[PDB]
């Protein structure tokens, strides 16, 4: 339910944010874990075994893999190319569908809070210091 | 349906509450091995091997998790066989080219767990770099942090033949990239222990890109027959250096190369230099654009080609505050054309030369547009010759040597 | 449904970024004055500020008309994400065709700025799509003097450089920079025209 | 303009401009008092007589 | 009296969405003044004031056209109609009236929500140099003089720079007159 990393990738494969929400932990110990998973999760968007259809207004969630006891869940919204990938630890999952839809509204909060600061009409347009250091002070408000 | 089998692989893992029994579910992964034979219908294809390799990768991760309560070195000698087999399976005719680099780095992390062996990650620069300033800013820090101790530890300085750079140049580029991508406060030990070696090994042929230390300008004033020359303020990124830094203002037909110095001891942020310049060219013309090189030579030309065509127009005009120069006037003449040149003289004496410049050859002191160079001259007279004479140009280059 | 505010303050806001454009270009810092709390502000109003563009030097006018499409660019590429959250189904980012996003914009943007469709769309198949609307909304209420109708089209020609920027912004939301022109193109019964490139 | 340098005036300048000269004076390091005296002199010699 | 007639005008008025438009429009034309001046912030207030003046002077005739109101004279009546049937008709919000002066003159205009600074985060270089919604002082100064008053308006604080509310301290300084239709014979 509470994630262990979130990540947002732009029109290219350049990462916009690879964010850990339990930030300065005792088991920080590397940031390589939750980073190489995102680097392989961009490669799992042209894997032919999973496929995202292109007809509906609400784009869909997927359950791509599990590794290190961390499950990933990814969306490709099809219009601004936004590849958004999250992870949870393995035994926080219950296997039910109410938490699955809670994961879907976790996505519908974080897509909303990214496109809000995509439409903050005072920034200069780019991936500057400002956008990341606004995204973290909104994600610390969302995730304590 | 393998995805449905992955749902089956998500099924019993949902119903797992005993990690000694779930290793028998890893035996169900062996049953997935009994599905891996039962998914095969041929020898090889692209999409078939791409579907095949992921279940073997999940079984390899389960076999890696099987040794969580710890076969002495058999795991660390044998898991690379299945890892290289999985990378060879996922290297089959599709663009999955971040699995290859991550799998090669996963093999390299176990090569470093052995003795500091022959490198593949440090082998090719770009390969080892893996989009250092394009991929991210964390994975490549460790992928260079292992390679730095690999090239340092091996103590044999014959590099690989992607480009034979068999020196400390590759490790200096690694040190510069790791110091650029670091945190600021915590990288003192990363800075000093790899900045010390290039002092003793000063190969010192480097052309950096200057993302660590930044620069900004100010107004420009005069000095004692010298230019104050745009009293710049620089940032800081590391401990110290010793650079003979010089900027390069360049007009539409020349390059001033002013704002020079000799010594620098920049350690603090907002460095705020003065950069006093001699050799003030172009009569301090106003159209001197900033090529803005700022080649801070900290035992390497760490330049920054900060170029545009913004027309901000650094003017930096002249001043006359009792310093030695030369002028031109033609008074007390006879009934034919001439010229004269008086200099506000001083102690030290050296040379000057004047040249005509037009579309035709308008003035002619000789038969051609001559020089009439002289050493230690106060005032004299130079003649001219015939053209459609209304107003010609001139250029009087005076190597005065009052300064250096 | 949604929270709403009134159209008559928005349309009157939308009419007058062109006096804002000449007040940002001409005033780099008969003109009048006013005061506030130990200050002053030098004022010039809209009738004596569009009429400085009928007497405009040509680099000054073309310097102004980049700013109107820059405003339109910023509001378009900020508007497209919220219209994606409205619905925006069945199209992609690289978007190999063009009619499926020209079906998008007339049904989905131009309803949210002006309340109706772009009612005509002509298909040159090499990529020049003509978008024709007959009664454009903010130019419902502008007229010149007693039959001086020739000298008002060239007077009112900055006001169509907002939907240059709108269709630049909603296509830079889908990838790239293009080339745009405008027309007037009067009706057949009781006009405007835009290209694509 | 020297056509009225010997007809009821002297030092009356012709129709040049001063905004570009003021921009060139601002683009150098000229002080506010020196620019005040120079703008006052050019303002007086915008139209004068002697 | 008034609040019934305000909703009565909110049943025959043309409407559109206040999210996803108009915060976009006002933020785009403050980003232009941010970049046009070239990142200086104490000047954009004195251009947004001079633009809000010109947009208020023409708004006042529309507002008198929608609801038939007499010429307001005291600051009971202007403060009642601004809180009940000007901001309710045009922007769907209503303010509240605190901080009342002596001798019935200078009051405050605390805005509860604000559909001009709605969902805006303001960057750190303008914590002490910018007023964001300073088209509102433009519409009040250029709208209240057109019913032949004379006022002065200024923001005091804002939610973006400060935890305290968005309030405008409008001051009556004098009331203007009507002029007699010739100089003389």
From Swiss-Prot, chain A:
Gene Ontology biological process terms, A to Z: early endosome to Golgi transport; endoplasmic reticulum to Golgi vesicle-mediated transport; intra-Golgi vesicle-mediated transport; protein-containing complex assembly; retrograde transport, endosome to Golgi
Localization in the cell: Golgi apparatus, trans-Golgi network
A Gene Ontology term for the protein's cellular component: cytoplasm
Entry keyword annotation includes Repressor: no
Broad class of the protein's primary localization: Golgi
Keyword Aminoacyl-tRNA synthetase assigned: no
Pfam families to which the protein is assigned, alphabetical: Sedlin_N
The entry's keywords: Golgi apparatus
InterPro entries (UniProt xref): Longin-like_dom_sf, Sedlin
Family membership noted in the UniProt record: Belongs to the TRAPP small subunits family. Sedlin subfamily.
Subunit and interaction comment: Interacts with the TRAPP II complex; TRAPP II subunits TRS33 and TRS65 are required for this interaction.
Note: Present with 8660 molecules/cell in log phase SD medium.
Annotated function: Required, together with the TRAPP II subunit TRS33, for TRAPP II complex assembly or stability, and for proper Golgi localization of TRAPP and the Rab GTPase YPT31.
Protein name, UniProt field: TRAPP-associated protein TCA17
Annotated organism of origin: Saccharomyces cerevisiae (strain ATCC 204508 / S288c) (Baker's yeast)
Lineage, top ranks: Eukaryota, Fungi, Dikarya, Ascomycota, Saccharomycotina
Gene that specifies this protein: TCA17
Curated annotation (Swiss-Prot), chain C:
Pfam families xref list: TRAPP (PF04051)
One record GO biological process: endoplasmic reticulum to Golgi vesicle-mediated transport
Residue runs in coiled coils: none
Localization, UniProt: Golgi apparatus, cis-Golgi network; Endoplasmic reticulum; Preautophagosomal structure
CDD domains linked: TRAPPC6A_Trs33 (cd14944)
Gene Ontology annotations for the cellular component aspect, listed alphabetically: cis-Golgi network; cytosol; endoplasmic reticulum; phagophore assembly site; trans-Golgi network; TRAPP complex; TRAPPI protein complex; TRAPPII protein complex
Keywords noted in UniProt: Acetylation, Autophagy, Endoplasmic reticulum, ER-Golgi transport, Golgi apparatus, Transport
Family per record: Belongs to the TRAPP small subunits family. BET3 subfamily.
Function: Component of the TRAPP I, TRAPP II and TRAPP III complexes which act as guanine nucleotide exchange factors (GEF) for YPT1. TRAPP I plays a key role in the late stages of endoplasmic reticulum to Golgi traffic. TRAPP II plays a role in intra-Golgi transport. TRAPP III plays a role in autophagosome formation. Required for sporulation. Has a role late in meiosis following DNA replication.
Protein's UniProt name: Trafficking protein particle complex subunit 33
Gene source species: Saccharomyces cerevisiae (strain ATCC 204508 / S288c) (Baker's yeast)
Classification lineage: Eukaryota, Fungi, Dikarya, Ascomycota, Saccharomycotina
Chain's gene name: TRS33
From Swiss-Prot, chain D:
Subcellular location: Golgi apparatus
Function: Specific subunit of the TRAPP II complex, a highly conserved vesicle tethering complex that functions in the late Golgi as a guanine nucleotide exchange factor (GEF) for the Golgi YPT1 GTPase. TRS130 plays a role in the YPT GEF activity of TRAPP II in concert with the two other TRAPP II-specific subunits TRS65 and TRS120. Required for both the cytoplasm-to-vacuole targeting (Cvt) pathway and starvation-induced autophagy through its role in ATG8 and ATG9 trafficking.
Similarity section: Belongs to the TMEM1 family.
Self-association state and partner proteins as the record states: Part of the multisubunit TRAPP (transport protein particle) II complex composed of BET3, BET5, TRS20, TRS23, TRS31, TRS33, TRS65, TRS120 and TRS130. Interacts with YPT31 and YPT32.
Other facts: Present with 432 molecules/cell in log phase SD medium.
The protein's name: Trafficking protein particle complex II-specific subunit 130
Name of encoding gene: TRS130
First and last residues shown, out of full length: 903 to 952 of 1102
From Swiss-Prot, chain E:
Gene3D superfamilies named in the record: Trafficking protein particle complex subunit 3
Annotated GO biological process: cellular response to nitrogen starvation; cytoplasm to vacuole targeting by the Cvt pathway; endoplasmic reticulum to Golgi vesicle-mediated transport; intra-Golgi vesicle-mediated transport; macroautophagy; retrograde transport, endosome to Golgi
Covalently lipidated residues, kind S-palmitoyl cysteine: 72
Record InterPro entries: Bet3, NO_sig/Golgi_transp_ligand-bd, TRAPP_component
Entry's localization field: Golgi apparatus, cis-Golgi network; Endoplasmic reticulum; Preautophagosomal structure
Cellular component per GO, a single term: endoplasmic reticulum
Top-level taxon: Eukaryota
Keywords carried by this UniProt record: Autophagy, Endoplasmic reticulum, ER-Golgi transport, Golgi apparatus, Lipoprotein, Palmitate, Transport
One Pfam family from the record: TRAPP
Oligomer and partners: Part of the multisubunit TRAPP (transport protein particle) I complex composed of BET3, BET5, TRS20, TRS23, TRS31 and TRS33. Part of the multisubunit TRAPP (transport protein particle) II complex composed of BET3, BET5, TRS20, TRS23, TRS31, TRS33, TRS65, TRS85, TRS120 and TRS130. Part of the multisubunit TRAPP (transport protein particle) III complex composed of BET3, BET5, TRS20, TRS23, TRS31, TRS33 and TRS85.
Family membership noted in the UniProt record: Belongs to the TRAPP small subunits family. BET3 subfamily.
PANTHER family from the UniProt entry: TRAFFICKING PROTEIN PARTICLE COMPLEX SUBUNIT 3
Record's miscellaneous remark: Present with 2370 molecules/cell in log phase SD medium.
Protein name: Trafficking protein particle complex subunit BET3
């Amino acid at each position: 339910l509470r994630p262990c990393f979130v990540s947002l990738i732009d029109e290219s494969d350049k990462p916009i944010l690879i964010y850990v929400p339990n930030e300065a932990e005792n088991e920080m110990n590397d940031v390589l874990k939750y980073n190489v998973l995102s680097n392989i999760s961009l490669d799992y968007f042209e894997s032919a075994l999973v496929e995202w259809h292109s007809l509906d207004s609400k784009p869909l969630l997927k359950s791509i893999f599990q590794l290190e006891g961390v499950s990933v869940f990814a969306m490709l919204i099809k219009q601004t190319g936004l590849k958004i990938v999250i992870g949870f630890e393995q035994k926080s999952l219950s296997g039910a569908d109410d938490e699955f839809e809670a994961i879907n509204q976790i996505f519908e909060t974080v897509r909303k809070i990214y496109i809000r600061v995509k439409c903050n009409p005072l920034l200069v347009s780019g991936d500057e210091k400002s956008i990341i250091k606004s995204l973290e002070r909104k994600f610390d408000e969302l995730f304590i | 349906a393998f995805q449905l089998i992955k749902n089956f692989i998500e099924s019993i893992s949902i119903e797992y509450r005993k990690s000694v029994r779930l290793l028998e579910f890893k035996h169900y992964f062996i049953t997935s091995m009994l599905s891996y034979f039962e998914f095969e219908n041929v020898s090889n294809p692209l999409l078939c091997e791409i579907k095949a390799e992921l279940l073997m990768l999940k079984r390899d991760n389960w076999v890696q998790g099987v040794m969580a309560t710890s076969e002495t070195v058999f795991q660390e000698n044998f898991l690379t066989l299945t890892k290289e087999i999985l990378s060879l399976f996922n290297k089959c005719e599709g663009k999955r080219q971040r699995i290859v680099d991550i799998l090669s780095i996963e093999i390299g992390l176990l090569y470093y767990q052995g003795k500091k062996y022959e490198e593949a990650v440090s082998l090719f620069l770009s390969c080892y770099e893996y989009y250092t300033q394009t991929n991210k800013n964390s994975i490549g820090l460790k992928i260079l942090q292992v390679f730095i101790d690999s090239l340092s530890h091996c103590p044999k300085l014959d590099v690989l033949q992607i480009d034979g750079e068999s020196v400390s140049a590759s490790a200096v580029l690694t040190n510069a990239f790791l110091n650029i991508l670091k945190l600021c406060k915590d990288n003192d030990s990363k800075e000093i222990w790899w900045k010390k070696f290039m002092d003793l090994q000063m190969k010192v042929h480097l052309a950096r890109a200057n993302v660590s230390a930044i620069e900004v300008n100010l107004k420009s004033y005069g000095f004692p027959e010298d230019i104050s020359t745009k009293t710049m303020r620089l940032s800081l990124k590391n401990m110290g250096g010793d650079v003979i830094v010089f900027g390069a203002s360049d007009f539409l037909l020349k390059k001033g190369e002013n704002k020079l110095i000799l010594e620098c001891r920049d350690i603090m942020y907002g460095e705020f230099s003065l950069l006093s310049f001699e050799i003030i060219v172009e009569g301090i013309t106003f159209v001197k654009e900033f090529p803005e090189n700022q080649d801070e030579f900290i035992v390497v030309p760490e330049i920054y080609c900060k170029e545009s065509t913004k027309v901000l127009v650094k003017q930096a005009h002249n001043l006359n505050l009792g310093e030695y120069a030369l002028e031109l006037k033609s008074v007390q003449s006879d009934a034919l054309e001439s010229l004269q040149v008086e200099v506000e003289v001083q102690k030290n004496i050296g040379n000057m030369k004047n040249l005509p410049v037009s579309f035709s050859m308008d003035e002619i002191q000789a038969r051609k547009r001559y020089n009439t160079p002289f050493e230690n001259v106060r005032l004299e007279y130079y003649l001219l010759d015939q053209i459609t004479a209304f107003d010609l140009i001139i250029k009087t280059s005076f190597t005065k040597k009052n300064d250096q | 449904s949604l929270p709403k505010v009134s159209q008559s303050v928005y349309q009157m806001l939308l009419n007058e970024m062109v006096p804002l454009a000449m007040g940002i270009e001409r005033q780099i810092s008969i003109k009048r004055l006013k005061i506030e709390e130990h200050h002053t502000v030098d004022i010039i109003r809209s009738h004596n500020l569009i009429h400085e563009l009928y007497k405009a030097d040509e680099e000054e006018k073309e310097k102004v008309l980049a700013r109107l499409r820059n405003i339109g660019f910023q509001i378009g590429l900020k508007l497209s994400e919220l219209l994606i959250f409205s619905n925006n189904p069945n199209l992609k980012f690289k978007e190999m065709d063009l009619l499926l996003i020209m079906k998008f914009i007339c049904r989905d943007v131009w309803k949210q700025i002006f309340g109706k469709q772009i009612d005509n769309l002509k298909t040159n198949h090499r990529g020049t799509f003509y978008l024709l609307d007959y009664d454009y909304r903010p130019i419902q209420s502008f007229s010149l003097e007693e039959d001086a109708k020739n000298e008002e089209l060239k007077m009112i020609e900055p006001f169509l450089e907002i939907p240059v920027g709108i269709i630049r912004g909603v296509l830079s939301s889908l990838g790239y920079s293009s080339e745009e022109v405008i027309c007037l193109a009067s009706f057949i019964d009781r006009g405007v025209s835009f290209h694509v490139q | 303009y020297d056509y009225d340098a010997f007809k009821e005036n002297r030092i009356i300048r012709l129709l040049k401009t001063s905004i570009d000269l003021n921009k060139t004076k601002s683009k150098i390091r000229n002080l506010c008092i020196e620019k005040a005296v120079l703008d006052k002199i050019l303002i007086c010699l915008n139209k004068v007589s002697r | 009296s008034l609040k019934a007639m305000g909703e009565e005008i909110w049943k025959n008025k043309t409407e559109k969405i206040n999210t996803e438009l108009f915060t976009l429009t006002y933020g785009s034309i403050v980003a232009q003044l941010c970049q046009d001046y070239e990142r200086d912030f104490n000047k954009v207030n004195d251009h947004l004031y001079s633009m809000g003046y010109n947009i208020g002077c023409r708004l006042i005739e529309d507002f008198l056209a929608r609801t038939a109101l007499p010429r307001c004279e005291n600051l009971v009546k202007t403060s009642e109609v601004l809180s009940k049937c000007a901001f309710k008709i045009f922007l769907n919000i209503t303010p509240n009236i605190t901080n009342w002066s002596h001798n019935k003159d200078t009051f405050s205009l605390i805005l509860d929500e604000n559909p001009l600074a709605d969902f805006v985060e303001l960057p750190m270089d303008a914590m002490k140099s910018l007023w964001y919604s300073n088209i509102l002082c433009g519409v009040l100064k250029g709208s209240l003089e057109m019913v032949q008053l004379d006022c002065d308006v200024w923001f005091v604080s804002d939610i973006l720079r400060g935890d305290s509310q968005t309030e405008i301290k409008v001051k009556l300084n004098r009331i203007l007159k009507d002029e007699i239709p010739i100089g003389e014979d």
